[PDB]
Enzyme design. Structure first.
Site, short mmCIF file in Angstrom:
data_model
loop_
_atom_site.label_atom_id
_atom_site.label_comp_id
_atom_site.label_asym_id
_atom_site.label_seq_id
_atom_site.Cartn_x
_atom_site.Cartn_y
_atom_site.Cartn_z
N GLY A 193 43.26 32.82 39.37
CA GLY A 193 43.79 31.69 38.54
C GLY A 193 42.86 31.23 37.62
O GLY A 193 42.95 30.31 36.81
N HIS A 212 41.17 41.15 32.10
CA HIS A 212 42.16 41.26 33.02
C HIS A 212 43.17 40.24 33.03
O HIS A 212 44.36 40.30 33.70
CB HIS A 212 41.76 41.53 34.57
CG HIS A 212 41.04 40.31 35.07
ND1 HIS A 212 39.59 40.11 35.05
CD2 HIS A 212 41.72 39.36 35.85
CE1 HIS A 212 39.54 38.99 35.67
NE2 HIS A 212 40.77 38.20 36.08
N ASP A 229 34.47 42.65 30.79
CA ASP A 229 35.83 42.26 31.20
C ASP A 229 35.80 40.79 30.16
O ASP A 229 35.53 39.59 30.57
CB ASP A 229 35.88 41.55 32.62
CG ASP A 229 37.20 41.31 33.18
OD1 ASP A 229 38.10 41.19 32.33
OD2 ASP A 229 37.36 40.81 34.37
N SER A 256 40.04 33.06 36.53
CA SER A 256 39.88 34.23 35.77
C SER A 256 40.01 33.71 34.27
O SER A 256 40.58 33.23 33.74
CB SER A 256 40.83 35.26 35.87
OG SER A 256 40.86 35.86 37.07
N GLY A 257 38.64 34.21 33.63
CA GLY A 257 38.55 33.82 32.10
C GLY A 257 38.08 32.41 31.89
O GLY A 257 37.69 32.09 30.77
N1 LIG Z 1 35.87 35.21 44.34
C1 LIG Z 1 35.89 34.86 42.98
N2 LIG Z 1 34.91 34.59 42.43
C2 LIG Z 1 37.01 35.49 42.16
C3 LIG Z 1 37.17 34.93 40.99
C4 LIG Z 1 38.10 35.26 40.33
C5 LIG Z 1 38.99 36.37 40.38
N3 LIG Z 1 39.85 36.92 39.63
C6 LIG Z 1 41.07 37.80 40.19
C7 LIG Z 1 40.78 39.29 39.46
N4 LIG Z 1 39.49 39.45 39.04
C8 LIG Z 1 39.74 40.66 38.77
C9 LIG Z 1 41.05 41.36 38.75
C10 LIG Z 1 41.54 42.32 38.13
C11 LIG Z 1 41.20 43.41 37.57
C12 LIG Z 1 41.68 44.53 37.19
C13 LIG Z 1 43.03 44.73 37.54
C14 LIG Z 1 43.53 43.87 38.28
C15 LIG Z 1 43.18 42.59 38.86
N5 LIG Z 1 41.80 40.20 39.33
C16 LIG Z 1 38.71 37.25 41.92
C17 LIG Z 1 37.78 36.60 42.71
O1 LIG Z 1 37.64 37.30 43.85
C18 LIG Z 1 38.47 38.32 44.19
C19 LIG Z 1 39.48 37.90 44.62
C20 LIG Z 1 40.84 38.65 44.52
C21 LIG Z 1 42.15 38.19 44.82
C22 LIG Z 1 42.17 36.92 45.22
N6 LIG Z 1 41.18 36.02 45.36
C23 LIG Z 1 39.96 36.38 44.93
#
Ligand SMILES: N=C(N)c1ccc(NCc2ncc(-c3ccccc3)[nH]2)cc1OCc1cccnc1
Length: 222
Positions: free
Chosen positions: A174, A41, A85, A176-177
């Site tokens: 932020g 992603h 992912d 992510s990855g």
């Molecule tokens: N709580 C966590 N451990 C957590 C860690 C990482 C992420 N990354 C963001 C992210 N993951 C997947 C996508 C994505 C996939 C496909 C299409 C578009 C987007 N985007 C999100 C997380 O929790 C949800 C979340 C969402 C938004 C703001 N904060 C937390």
């Protein structure tokens, strides 16, 4: 990364910062001088990889920068469900290794023991801002059955769950990855979790790196 603190500047030499449009997008993990592993992603145009970074707000003597030759997303990645992912980034220039730029070995054993882990990244903190200084937190692996109840029908065998029941230490947007490190091996990649970030209630969900041994090998050798 919420409820953590600044990392020891010498403890994260595998950490990559991924930029697009001049802002931090994702973390990544250096796994070979020519390759960074991150989440699928995180695919965006013109990714710029920064290695040897600790503080994003200052120019550091340890930092190295590279454009991406090609981005290799796993053929079975499903953006709707976050399944598989994972993405490999080939660096235009091999990483100049130092005490502050080093690859992290992968966990190839899916039955691997170690439950005590750590996460790191430049993602959103508790105050909601994006920190200049990298954040670290010790977290623990959450059993498959327990994660399955936190997110019904959403957890596949290509995912691992981890979090902190006590204070809610968790990865965030932020991060992510970025790496989930267990026994000084890459066990997982920051994928998704609860909204807002915090793992008190529901744990963080990570890509299960041990499942991708063959695909990572085949991609690197291509
Ligand atoms: N709580 C966590 N451990 C957590 C860690 C990482 C992420 N990354 C963001 C992210 N993951 C997947 C996508 C994505 C996939 C496909 C299409 C578009 C987007 N985007 C999100 C997380 O929790 C949800 C979340 C969402 C938004 C703001 N904060 C937390």
């Amino acid at each position: 990364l919420v409820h953590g603190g600044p990392c020891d500047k010498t403890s994260h030499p595998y950490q990559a910062a991924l930029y697009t449009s001049g802002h931090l997008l994702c973390g990544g993990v250096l796994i070979h001088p020519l390759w960074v592993l991150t989440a699928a992603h995180c695919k965006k145009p013109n990714l710029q990889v920064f290695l040897g970074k600790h503080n994003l707000g200052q120019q550091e003597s340890s930092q190295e920068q590279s454009s991406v030759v090609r981005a290799v997303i796993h053929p079975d990645y499903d953006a709707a469900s976050h399944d598989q992912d994972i993405m490999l980034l080939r660096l235009a220039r091999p990483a100049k290794l130092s005490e502050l730029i080093q690859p992290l070995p992968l966990e190839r054993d899916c039955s691997a023991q170690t439950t005590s882990c750590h996460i790191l990244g430049w993602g959103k903190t508790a105050d909601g801002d994006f920190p200049d200084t990298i954040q670290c937190a010790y977290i623990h692996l959450v059993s498959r059955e327990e994660c399955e109840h936190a997110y019904p029908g959403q957890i596949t065998q290509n995912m691992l769950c981890a979090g902190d029941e006590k204070y809610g230490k968790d990865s965030c947007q932020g991060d992510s990855g970025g790496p989930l490190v267990c026994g000084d091996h890459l066990r997982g990649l920051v994928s998704w979790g609860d909204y807002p970030c915090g793992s008190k209630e529901r744990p963080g969900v990570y890509t299960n790196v041990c499942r991708y041994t063959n695909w990572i090998q085949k991609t690197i050798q291509a």
